[PDB]
Design an enzyme around this catalytic site. Structure first.
Site, PDB file in Angstrom:
ATOM      1  N   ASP A 123       0.848  -1.190   0.000  1.00  0.00           N
ATOM      2  CA  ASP A 123       0.000   0.000   0.000  1.00  0.00           C
ATOM      3  C   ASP A 123       0.886   1.244   0.000  1.00  0.00           C
ATOM      4  O   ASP A 123       1.430   1.674   1.018  1.00  0.00           O
ATOM      5  CB  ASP A 123      -0.944  -0.017   1.193  1.00  0.00           C
ATOM      6  CG  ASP A 123      -1.884   1.170   1.205  1.00  0.00           C
ATOM      7  OD1 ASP A 123      -1.974   1.875   0.180  1.00  0.00           O
ATOM      8  OD2 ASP A 123      -2.543   1.395   2.240  1.00  0.00           O
ATOM      9  N   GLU A 156      25.767  15.547  12.922  1.00  0.00           N
ATOM     10  CA  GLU A 156      25.957  15.405  14.360  1.00  0.00           C
ATOM     11  C   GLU A 156      24.579  15.359  15.005  1.00  0.00           C
ATOM     12  O   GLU A 156      23.893  16.383  15.082  1.00  0.00           O
ATOM     13  CB  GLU A 156      26.787  16.555  14.926  1.00  0.00           C
ATOM     14  CG  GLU A 156      28.026  16.893  14.118  1.00  0.00           C
ATOM     15  CD  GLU A 156      28.674  18.191  14.562  1.00  0.00           C
ATOM     16  OE1 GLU A 156      28.038  18.944  15.329  1.00  0.00           O
ATOM     17  OE2 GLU A 156      29.820  18.460  14.146  1.00  0.00           O
ATOM     18  N   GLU A 176      21.937  14.737  18.134  1.00  0.00           N
ATOM     19  CA  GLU A 176      21.839  14.890  19.577  1.00  0.00           C
ATOM     20  C   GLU A 176      20.495  14.359  20.048  1.00  0.00           C
ATOM     21  O   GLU A 176      19.474  14.552  19.382  1.00  0.00           O
ATOM     22  CB  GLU A 176      22.004  16.352  19.988  1.00  0.00           C
ATOM     23  CG  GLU A 176      23.258  17.003  19.433  1.00  0.00           C
ATOM     24  CD  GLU A 176      23.266  18.507  19.615  1.00  0.00           C
ATOM     25  OE1 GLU A 176      22.195  19.077  19.911  1.00  0.00           O
ATOM     26  OE2 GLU A 176      24.344  19.120  19.461  1.00  0.00           O
ATOM     27  N   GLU A 227      26.378  16.186  26.083  1.00  0.00           N
ATOM     28  CA  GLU A 227      26.033  17.498  25.557  1.00  0.00           C
ATOM     29  C   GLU A 227      25.754  18.457  26.713  1.00  0.00           C
ATOM     30  O   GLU A 227      25.850  18.095  27.888  1.00  0.00           O
ATOM     31  CB  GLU A 227      24.843  17.392  24.601  1.00  0.00           C
ATOM     32  CG  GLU A 227      24.742  18.512  23.570  1.00  0.00           C
ATOM     33  CD  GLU A 227      25.969  18.628  22.685  1.00  0.00           C
ATOM     34  OE1 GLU A 227      26.711  17.634  22.547  1.00  0.00           O
ATOM     35  OE2 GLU A 227      26.191  19.719  22.121  1.00  0.00           O
ATOM     36  N   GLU A 244      25.496  13.346  22.272  1.00  0.00           N
ATOM     37  CA  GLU A 244      25.719  13.649  20.868  1.00  0.00           C
ATOM     38  C   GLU A 244      26.587  12.566  20.249  1.00  0.00           C
ATOM     39  O   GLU A 244      27.531  12.082  20.878  1.00  0.00           O
ATOM     40  CB  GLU A 244      26.383  15.021  20.700  1.00  0.00           C
ATOM     41  CG  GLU A 244      27.028  15.254  19.347  1.00  0.00           C
ATOM     42  CD  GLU A 244      27.630  16.639  19.221  1.00  0.00           C
ATOM     43  OE1 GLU A 244      26.905  17.630  19.454  1.00  0.00           O
ATOM     44  OE2 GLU A 244      28.830  16.738  18.893  1.00  0.00           O
ATOM     45  N   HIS A 298      23.319  19.359  13.197  1.00  0.00           N
ATOM     46  CA  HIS A 298      24.151  20.119  12.279  1.00  0.00           C
ATOM     47  C   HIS A 298      24.605  19.231  11.129  1.00  0.00           C
ATOM     48  O   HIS A 298      24.755  18.016  11.276  1.00  0.00           O
ATOM     49  CB  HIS A 298      25.356  20.703  13.011  1.00  0.00           C
ATOM     50  CG  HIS A 298      25.030  21.249  14.365  1.00  0.00           C
ATOM     51  ND1 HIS A 298      24.456  22.487  14.548  1.00  0.00           N
ATOM     52  CD2 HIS A 298      25.200  20.726  15.602  1.00  0.00           C
ATOM     53  CE1 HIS A 298      24.283  22.704  15.839  1.00  0.00           C
ATOM     54  NE2 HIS A 298      24.727  21.651  16.501  1.00  0.00           N
ATOM     55  N   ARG A 324      30.438  31.163  16.671  1.00  0.00           N
ATOM     56  CA  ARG A 324      29.658  29.934  16.655  1.00  0.00           C
ATOM     57  C   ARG A 324      28.157  30.174  16.631  1.00  0.00           C
ATOM     58  O   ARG A 324      27.411  29.281  16.214  1.00  0.00           O
ATOM     59  CB  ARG A 324      30.002  29.069  17.871  1.00  0.00           C
ATOM     60  N   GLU A 378      29.267  23.946   7.795  1.00  0.00           N
ATOM     61  CA  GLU A 378      28.313  23.456   8.779  1.00  0.00           C
ATOM     62  C   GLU A 378      27.088  24.357   8.807  1.00  0.00           C
ATOM     63  O   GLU A 378      27.211  25.572   8.988  1.00  0.00           O
ATOM     64  CB  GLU A 378      28.948  23.389  10.169  1.00  0.00           C
ATOM     65  CG  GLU A 378      28.014  22.884  11.254  1.00  0.00           C
ATOM     66  CD  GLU A 378      28.686  22.793  12.609  1.00  0.00           C
ATOM     67  OE1 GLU A 378      29.157  23.834  13.111  1.00  0.00           O
ATOM     68  OE2 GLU A 378      28.745  21.681  13.173  1.00  0.00           O
ATOM     69  N   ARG A 423      23.636  24.957  10.930  1.00  0.00           N
ATOM     70  CA  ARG A 423      23.237  24.671  12.300  1.00  0.00           C
ATOM     71  C   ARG A 423      21.738  24.812  12.535  1.00  0.00           C
ATOM     72  O   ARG A 423      21.298  24.763  13.687  1.00  0.00           O
ATOM     73  CB  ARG A 423      24.005  25.579  13.259  1.00  0.00           C
ATOM     74  CG  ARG A 423      25.507  25.360  13.229  1.00  0.00           C
ATOM     75  CD  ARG A 423      26.254  26.569  13.754  1.00  0.00           C
ATOM     76  NE  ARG A 423      25.828  26.930  15.099  1.00  0.00           N
ATOM     77  CZ  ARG A 423      26.253  26.331  16.202  1.00  0.00           C
ATOM     78  NH1 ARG A 423      27.124  25.338  16.157  1.00  0.00           N
ATOM     79  NH2 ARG A 423      25.792  26.740  17.380  1.00  0.00           N
TER      80      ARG A 423
HETATM   81 MG   LIG Z   1      26.705  19.696  19.743  1.00  0.00          MG
END
Ligand SMILES: [Mg+2]
Ligand SMILES: [Mg+2]
Ligand SMILES: [Mg+2]
Lengths: 443, 443, 443
Positions: free
Chosen positions: A53, A131, A133, A188, A195, A244, A315, A332, A334
């Site tokens: 299905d 990554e 978490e 974390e 993580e 990320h 960051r 990266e 985020r």
């Molecule tokens: Mg982290």
């Protein structure tokens, strides 16, 4: 080892005594769907495929039963990391085809494959290392999930040390037993938050692994008496869980982002790739943050980014460039959270970047200052935009975006919007207990 | 055996089937930080090192993520004293390097290494044998730590004798299985308080063992159903837990302190070394006593010292000279508590002592009487100073100390003060239940 | 191995050490009836048969005991999929004969055999693969069935993942152990609802398997601490449990329904077969939905069909034609529920289908639109009739149905009506708690 052909797959099943084979695929909204097949049926299934299905791929907004055929892919065969007394268990993936033989365009996996072909037309290929978490809560007396913490550790802490330590170790070993090649696992910032970093590998394989990773961890926690949750923000006052996405583009076997002749060791293409991402990130924010809870995480005052900027040392920026260079050069993003659909998220992430490269979009000057400390006039002067505040705002942006509609296709676009639209409408009419505490006595 | 090369480390992993490798390092505030690495990644890690988020070193006051590389040290490889059914587990240490290749000056381990190098310039090396004290409480029905006593024993008592006795023996055996070479272990003055003594060794090796000792003991207690606590004062009305530091300077393979020709059998250098410690001990008291609870222990009426003095026979003095002579000559400082950071504490002790030797600081006449039994006028007449009363007072002294900033470096100095300053401000605004029991009815 | 003769059955019993033989048969109302026989009695039983109280086949309306003789059928010998420490257990089926030697016409199995023989007159044979759906609840502290969910999964979800996951896997393995040849097993729309699909086979063998399937699953759930329920609608607001029936007619070893020449790839006989089903489906609806609760499931707004129509693309119709063609061509009827009697339900399906073929009943135009969205005038204009709203209405229809009475025989027809009539009368005089909540305060 690695299985390539259906003969190799059949040989492995007989050798290791696999009793059941489970298909694996995801619907539009990112839920994991599967059904079991007896081992004897496997040989017939490889020859002709399995009818099922196909309406289950259209989310929970399905109306009518529809039939599509799934053709198994031998290269995706793998054995689950638990050993019941009955026998071994294995999983497998495949492609969805309509009865007339044409591939079904509503499959999220097919969406990613089309994006890969578009990138391949220009000679590029993507490698993604995410990554992920997650939290680790206790179970009540009835086995239902709860939010009881298991430890009060901090960032990179050596916790837990009680019986929950073995549960964390078992998850790491089970993933390694399947050849996941984990980079590193650590605590974390939030209590009872962990993580796990995936190996930097091919995008198609990574997306399948991410889906497999989710129900593997959840199954292990139950059998050990705990619960693993992937909510973007299960508790108030602590950091949320995000996913990320480090990414890189390779042409002719070499990284294209790395440029030894530039002061920042970044190529001109990398600047355009970031420019494309920044231009369109507002439109497909709903895909990266698909649930209502996702926007409780996107609030100022935590590691989550709420402003559109790119930086090298900062960051808090939405797009961060790690100091690593050479073949390991990566970008990266985020914004995404584990609740997102990896197939749709990566496909849009690839498509947005290519459009920037094709159109040579300038990313603008980086933001090396703390945006949260600036004032609104400063942000207005600098022209810094912000992500959608809530799910309803994100849908409105994504709903008029022709680029998202073109990338995801008409069928997925309409179905995704309707499912999210109904979900938001239900949420907006609820009276939360917080309102009662604040308003019942005052008014 | 002892592993010295990466080849030996790899051979041991294959031989004893170690599945996971855990790094080990401490932040500025003394919390133990670690993350896991699969055994397969070990060979690559030795060649190129591991990239990690180094903002965890700066404590919980981190703002922006910063990347720098950790290079493993094969000489610190060791296997943890528990055997999971999956496989063996081992830990390892290393040095922190910035991306440009320069070592990171914010690492507490690097602070101690600089202090060792400074002593090497004068031809000295220091050996430290610390005495660690801890409690052993019971766990509640939910496994959370409590303060329930396990026995009402006294000093050096043959306690406990119930099943908690086996738990204590397991801790001793596990530490010996790791090769710590314990000297002695016995009950302490307070109920359910125990003490473990270390042998002399190189200060760098001893500091690493102290960090390893802390989470090894805590892990064992959980798996047996108990809890080990390192609070400087967990209960009121009973003695607190301290970490005395026996220390000695070795030059040319012989003890510097010993001197057969003096009436006290102590060299002139030892007098200067004590003089340097007494002059500066007030400044860096915050490092030896980092938490608020440490100053609930530094109150008159117990074994904890609160006045700055040195003696040969009296025990209430801050610095005590044991009757042992020859190569066993040593100096014991009785201010620190197990909550302190061993790297920062030992580095300051070494640097402060060396400064006294260079400047020929006279330690003054020893105090052979009971200082507590004296009066304020007598203490004023004798010029006996006292340690800071509370954490805020200690910070004010440390903050203006030029010598402390020079030893610890600018980066560590600023970060340490800010973390402590925020911690004190939160504590000073709380309304403790003791106030309610005293003032609610009265006022 | 396929057992054929009584000698083979006896050899298997001695070889595998079977200690007890259980007969298997069902009454008129669909309850499963059985009694035990020692292994030594088996040889005598094959020669002469077993005398038993034959009043148990008439349901709970039995008044006077009557004696009939059961003649065992060696071809139905199977070994149940559990291993008591005492020894193996096996089941067997057979035919019921009156003392004078004539077969008993009240046996539901005999009803199906007559239907098969009637089809054999025209050279047709039937293959049926049903899709059975059931729930999985938790047992209370006293081991009594209750209705607490085990998971909140959805359609095709990869649930459950807790200990209930192993219980579900055991059911799949046990069924495969007996040789059921399951096609696929998956989660269903409602929480804690699962579905299992069977392969095509002769209708006689399939009916016996369905009866065996029911108590095998129930027994497994008890021994693992859970409960499996086949109630057509155990919870309000969620989908019910149904047993769809895919059927096909084979002539000369070829599929009658398939016709490559027709645009829809369906033969003229298939159109007549559907036409016969639509004409008479109203009359024997009580057989497919025997209990009162069955009509709670047959309400608008769910997957259950409530209008008489057939479609190819629309899937909300009562009769659906799957897109499969060739030898896999089939017709699916979606009215029945697992509480129905498989022998009576399948027998009436054949009789209704063949009667359409004989009379060349035209099935009319298919309905490709959503019937639930149409207006009453539209459905009145389209002539779309409706299934009975409640059990009382169904009995009234079935009771004047000349076709049903001659198909089921006089004895079964009268007994079935009386049993259902008494059941309905008891239900219609109850005061449900829902009435009290709505009417106590208002009136
Ligand atoms: Mg982290
Ligand atoms: Mg002591
Ligand atoms: Mg179904």
């Amino acid at each position: 080892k690695k299985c390539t052909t259906k003969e190799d797959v059949l040989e492995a099943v007989k050798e290791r005594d696999v009793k059941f084979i489970r298909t694996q695929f995801t619907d539009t909204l990112g839920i994991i769907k599967s059904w079991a097949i007896p081992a004897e049926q496997l040989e017939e299934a490889f020859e002709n495929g399995v009818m099922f299905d196909g309406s289950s791929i259209q989310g929970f907004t399905r109306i009518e039963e529809s039939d599509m055929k799934l053709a198994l892919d031998p290269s995706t065969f793998r054995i689950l990391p638990w050993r019941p007394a009955t026998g071994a268990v294995a999983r497998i993936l495949g492609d969805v085809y309509l009865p007339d033989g044409n591939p079904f365009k509503g499959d999220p996996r097919y969406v990613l494959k089309t994006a890969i072909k578009e990138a391949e037309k220009m000679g590029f290929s993507m490698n993604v290392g995410p990554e992920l978490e997650f939290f680790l809560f206790k179970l009540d007396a009835n086995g239902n999930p709860t939010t009881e913490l298991t430890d009060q550790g901090g960032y990179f802490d050596f916790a837990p040390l009680d019986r929950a330590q073995d549960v964390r170790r078992d998850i790491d070993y089970a993933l390694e037993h399947m050849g996941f090649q984990i980079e590193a696992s650590h605590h974390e910032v939030a209590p009872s938050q962990h993580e796990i970093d995936f190996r930097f590998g091919d995008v198609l394989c990574t997306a399948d692994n991410v889906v497999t990773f989710k129900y593997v961890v959840k199954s292990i926690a139950y059998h050990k008496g705990y619960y693993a949750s992937f909510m973007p923000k299960p508790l108030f006052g602590v950091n949320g869980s995000g996913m990320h996405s480090n990414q890189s583009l390779f042409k002719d076997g070499k990284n294209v982002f790395y440029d030894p002749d530039t002061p920042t060791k970044l190529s001109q293409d990398a600047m355009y790739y970031i420019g494309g991402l920044l231009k369109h990130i507002r439109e497909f924010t709903a895909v990266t943050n698909p649930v209502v809870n996702s926007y409780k995480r996107l609030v100022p005052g935590y590691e989550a980014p709420v402003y559109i900027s790119w930086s090298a040392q900062n960051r808090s920026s939405l797009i961060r460039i790690p100091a690593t260079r050479g073949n390991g050069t990566r970008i990266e993003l985020r914004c995404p959270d584990p609740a997102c659909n990896p197939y749709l998220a990566f496909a849009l992430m690839l498509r947005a970047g290519l459009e920037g490269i094709k159109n040579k979009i300038d990313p603008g000057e980086p933001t090396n200052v703390n945006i949260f400390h600036l004032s609104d006039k400063e942000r207005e002067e600098r022209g810094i935009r912000s992500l959608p505040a809530d799910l309803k705002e994100a849908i409105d942006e994504m709903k008029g975006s022709k680029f998202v509609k073109e990338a995801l296709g008409e069928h997925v676009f309409s179905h995704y919007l309707c499912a999210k639209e109904m979900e938001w409408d239900e949420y907006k009419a609820v009276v939360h207990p917080w309102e009662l505490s604040r308003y019942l006595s005052m008014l």
